[PDB]
Amino acid sequence: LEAEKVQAAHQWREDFASNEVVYYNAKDDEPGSQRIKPVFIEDANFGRQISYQHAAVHIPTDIYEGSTIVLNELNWTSALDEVFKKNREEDPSLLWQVFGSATGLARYYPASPWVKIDLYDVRRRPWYIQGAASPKDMLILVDVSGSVSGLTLKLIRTSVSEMLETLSDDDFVNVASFNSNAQDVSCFQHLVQANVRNKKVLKDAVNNITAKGITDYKKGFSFAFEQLLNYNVSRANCNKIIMLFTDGGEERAQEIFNKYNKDKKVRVFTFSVGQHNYDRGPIQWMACENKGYYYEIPSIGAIRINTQEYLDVLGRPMVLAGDKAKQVQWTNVYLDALELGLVITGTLPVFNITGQFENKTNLKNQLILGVMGVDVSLEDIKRLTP
């Protein structure tokens, strides 16, 4: 509630040299933003040095602090600290309270220093993904024609594996491929629960694909549409999406889309992988007629960012739901990034409700600001069961 009402009152700025923001960066031992030096007393419950006086901020190593996007987020996410303390004072047994922002930075309370190279991203965590969208029925289409052989084939293999890391146990996935003929890459032949074991099989099978043949989008898409209409096995009965990993071409396949989803019940997301001189117009067209998105992955450095942005599209019907979408969800048991043992995390999305009095903009209000989250350790639950 406080994050929603504070963001609306925020006035977007463009300079910060005069008005420096004060915050504690977790990953540290700069004009435009002042840093803090906390006391860091030792405390129980947590197994590290903490400071109950302010909230730390984690910014990913590939996200530049001091940008206009980051600095503006660092300003309006300062009233959260006065709510962080009120929750901790009311419940002294409160563990990490965090705000995973869609910008990329995570603000958590109490402040503690961050834990080789740091690859942590808040937008890829299971507790963030489960609150950013509803369960899905992903079905990955992989172009294994001859034209993708070489560098753009090992980018496709990496991208598909990196995409499978964004699926929880509530989502059902399957991977297919097509070169003048559509077939599965593994032994599954239908949507599977996409748990740890099932995803490892798909990751092993994706790495063993070879690029050779003539591309045929009509047979690849007919196979995908016929696998999303099974209804003979266990499914999610929710978001039905097709992710197409290809390079380019001239075929639009409008007759397949006009036959299988005339009412547009299935979203199509298209990816253009690698550096090439093939046409991208048909690729972008499939992503606009079907309510999806078009993504570009030109190198190995763009794989991580572009394989997690489809959750922004999937969250559009969730924002328009209203307060019905504000349901607290609990994740599976996992190990905390800041070493604390086995924990489960609550979850609540945050909506952009600026200009809600007039209801006139609705241009960037279809996306979520971020996901709220509070950690509950398994030792806390074990204490309630003597």
């Binding site: 969208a133 509803s134 972008q284 992503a287 993504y295 969730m318 739901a321 279809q366």
Partner: peptide, 23 residues
Amino acid sequence: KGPDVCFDNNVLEDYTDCGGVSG
């Protein structure tokens, strides 16, 4: 047993912002 909630195919959704219209 899967979740009982489901949020998709909203009529009010804009969906006019893909990644190819801009470029």
